[PDB]
Amino acid sequence: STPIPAMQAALAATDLDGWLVYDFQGLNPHARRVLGIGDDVFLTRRFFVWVPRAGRAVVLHNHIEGGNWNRITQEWDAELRPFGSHAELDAALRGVVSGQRLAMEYSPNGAVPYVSRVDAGTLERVRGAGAAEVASSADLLQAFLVWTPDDLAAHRRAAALLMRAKDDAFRLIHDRLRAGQSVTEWEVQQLIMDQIRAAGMQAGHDVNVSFGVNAADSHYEPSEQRSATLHPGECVLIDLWAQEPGRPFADVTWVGFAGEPGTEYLDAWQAVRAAREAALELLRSRFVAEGYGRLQGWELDRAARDAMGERWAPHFLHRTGHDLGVQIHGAGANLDDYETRDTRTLTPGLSVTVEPGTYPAAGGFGIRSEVDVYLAPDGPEVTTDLQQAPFILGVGDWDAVRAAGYGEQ
Amino acid sequence: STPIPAMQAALAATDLDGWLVYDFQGLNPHARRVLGIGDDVFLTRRFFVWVPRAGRAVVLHNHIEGGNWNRITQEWDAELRPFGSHAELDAALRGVVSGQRLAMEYSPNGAVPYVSRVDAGTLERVRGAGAAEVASSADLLQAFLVWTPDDLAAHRRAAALLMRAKDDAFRLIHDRLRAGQSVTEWEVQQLIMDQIRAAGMQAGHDVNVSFGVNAADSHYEPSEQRSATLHPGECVLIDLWAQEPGRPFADVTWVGFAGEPGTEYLDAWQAVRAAREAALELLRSRFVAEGYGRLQGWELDRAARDAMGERWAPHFLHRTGHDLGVQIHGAGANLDDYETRDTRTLTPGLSVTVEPGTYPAAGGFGIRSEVDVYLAPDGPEVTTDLQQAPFILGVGDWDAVRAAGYGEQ
Numbered sequence A, B: 001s002t003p004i005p006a007m008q009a010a011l012a013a014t015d016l017d018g019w020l021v022y023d024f025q026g027l028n029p030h031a032r033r034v035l036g037i038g039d040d041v042f043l044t045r046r047f048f049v050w051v052p053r054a055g056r057a058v059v060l061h062n063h064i065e066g067g068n069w070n071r072i073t074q075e076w077d078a079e080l081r082p083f084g085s086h087a088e089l090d091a092a093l094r095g096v097v098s099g100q101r102l103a104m105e106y107s108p109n110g111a112v113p114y115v116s117r118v119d120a121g122t123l124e125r126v127r128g129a130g131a132a133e134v135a136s137s138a139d140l141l142q143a144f145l146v147w148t149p150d151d152l153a154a155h156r157r158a159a160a161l162l163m164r165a166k167d168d169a170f171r172l173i174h175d176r177l178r179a180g181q182s183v184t185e186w187e188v189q190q191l192i193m194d195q196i197r198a199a200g201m202q203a204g205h206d207v208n209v210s211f212g213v214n215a216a217d218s219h220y221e222p223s224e225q226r227s228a229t230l231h232p233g234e235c236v237l238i239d240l241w242a243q244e245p246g247r248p249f250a251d252v253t254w255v256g257f258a259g260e261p262g263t264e265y266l267d268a269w270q271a272v273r274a275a276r277e278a279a280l281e282l283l284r285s286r287f288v289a290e291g292y293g294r295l296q297g298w299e300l301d302r303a304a305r306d307a308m309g310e311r312w313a314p315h316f317l318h319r320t321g322h323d324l325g326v327q328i329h330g331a332g333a334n335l336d337d338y339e340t341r342d343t344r345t346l347t348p349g350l351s352v353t354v355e356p357g358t359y360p361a362a363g364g365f366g367i368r369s370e371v372d373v374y375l376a377p378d379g380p381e382v383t384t385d386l387q388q389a390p391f392i393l394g395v396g397d398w399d400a401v402r403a404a405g406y407g408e409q
């Protein structure tokens, strides 16, 4: 196969002159992935592949691995240019980069480690060869993550399954509370996992059902060996996800409470809901104003965190959301100004989660509300349901508990 | 175990304030090797380990992997400092690097890819945190390559075996030529390999016996399936190496000719010998003048290449030599201003090969003369024999052929 058409199509949406892919052994996994180099290909020497906007790619390779490079590129219609000495390497590099505004796997300030792969010394060498500009390839790399129509349809089937499963899970808890019968996190988790598997889907890791203080630990997963029994007066948080094999996940988080919650929990909910709405509103309003192309992931985190307010933001020690793909935590832009300042631009055809929360462990509780957003070319759209209130579990009939949680009363 | 004493001992021989080890997943293999982190340890997040000249190491790690970091460091007597947000990371980094002259796995201009592992963006971040100087850790890394007395003794046993084996190999060729009996490269190779194995040693890759034009290909290895039969009027080159398991290799190259060589071959020999002597003489004279500590690997390549002269240097399209270790091509300084400009300093207790050659394939021939040099604290010393003339094979008695090759007539 040839990787060059896809790389040039990605470049066409930029104003850059080309993409300079550099690798040495395991340094830059993106190099081998974008170029379609098989894992079984043994490459011990450094190489560059220059891909201009239009025209032939240029492969700068050490002459000792010319045979492997002929095989790699036999369908590429590229120039293959061997080098031996550092003088030959530098002359070839000057030939390709001088006066060029180019991208490399580089992240300013090392903000995004998964993209920041080219070593400092090699970047110095590229600049010394006369490159006019070195920009991050992070946005180019996102072009490869665009969903197909079948990907979107599969995501929506997973979303619908999750909406059903979260209702059945919360109804189970509701029924147990009303009946005074014990229920554990693991039992609820397994109800959900059984539904995912029966639908031909898979979760990867077992889903998160958290009661009480466990909901304050984002890194909680109940198991058969260790899981909590629910008691009245404790919160519930369920973060569940599923995909059809090889298709994008859906991934949502819904909350409830065992009985009537107090004012503090309710206030925290309003703050988390306000955070979610602020992120969604900034995404919508920026798209209306200017389309996609300037809005960056970190800005939605800022919107959510600001809107959450001074009482509950100190207990929101997490990013606002993540790229959502065939990997649940996808390789594209995340909604993060917390762990990283993610300056990647939100890209049409990708999807992100919006999942602010607040986690006061000191009883202690955790709230998170997670929806998925597909960055459709005609505008961002939420693909999973919006919770308006925590489910108040064990009081009344389930249909009405659900309706209140949906704001349908 | 704890890696910190060895790192501080290495730092003591420098004027730097400390060594800042950075890694993210597979980016910097040196990080995990120097720190003694087992391959079975799953670390998904970036980390820094600050090792000052004296005092506690400081580990900056993501809080999500604190458990793994407790286990890694349980014998280190280090400070463990978690971070979550980028603001926390940057405050911690400023605390450790501000005003410090430090080393990282960084190679200016990307001259030495095996050392140049920290990404450009992370280096920007370290400088932005106030580091006073970022220097390459390349020389620090060489401190870990110093031979023990048992390593040196094992190297010398391998050297002695190679001196015997190369005599027996060339005597075999001599005898076959005198008798008019065919001899192949593979037959000679297998004589040598049998001797290596009988001595309890191992070669890794089968050794190089090259006849005629094959000696012009540095990347030639005969095999049972494909090997040449010697004819009168062709050169011979034998590059052979061996180690005791887990001990440093010896690695040498000796040349001969089937019958009396012409003036061109003899002139090439004088140039290669002059190149070898010039590298050895610069090493010796610099040590006498100033000891080790300033002389860099590339300078011996320049000496050899300059001395080879304008007729034969154009056919010397290779580095002058390599670090010699438990890996035949060791991780330390190489004698190279050809493929790379290796600015690493020649380090007492390591060994290098000096192996200039010239390879005019157009009959065509190749000459290389390789000796091993141990960088003893009291001065550099050659540990294998110095060839003074190519063996003139098939003429006279072997003892005299050998004596002429040794300059012993």
Ligand SMILES: [Cl-]
Pocket (backbone or CB within 6 Å): A024, A044, A045, A046, B113
């Ligand atoms: Cl290389």
Ligand SMILES: [Cl-]
Pocket (backbone or CB within 6 Å): A113, B024, B044, B045, B046
């Ligand atoms: Cl990380």
Ligand SMILES: [Zn+2]
Pocket (backbone or CB within 6 Å): A251, A252, A322, A353, A355, A370
């Ligand atoms: Zn999520």
Ligand SMILES: [Zn+2]
Pocket (backbone or CB within 6 Å): A239, A240, A241, A251, A252, A253, A355, A370
């Ligand atoms: Zn989720």
Ligand SMILES: [Zn+2]
Pocket (backbone or CB within 6 Å): B251, B252, B322, B353, B355, B370
């Ligand atoms: Zn060698």
Ligand SMILES: [Zn+2]
Pocket (backbone or CB within 6 Å): B239, B240, B241, B251, B252, B253, B355, B370
């Ligand atoms: Zn050799």
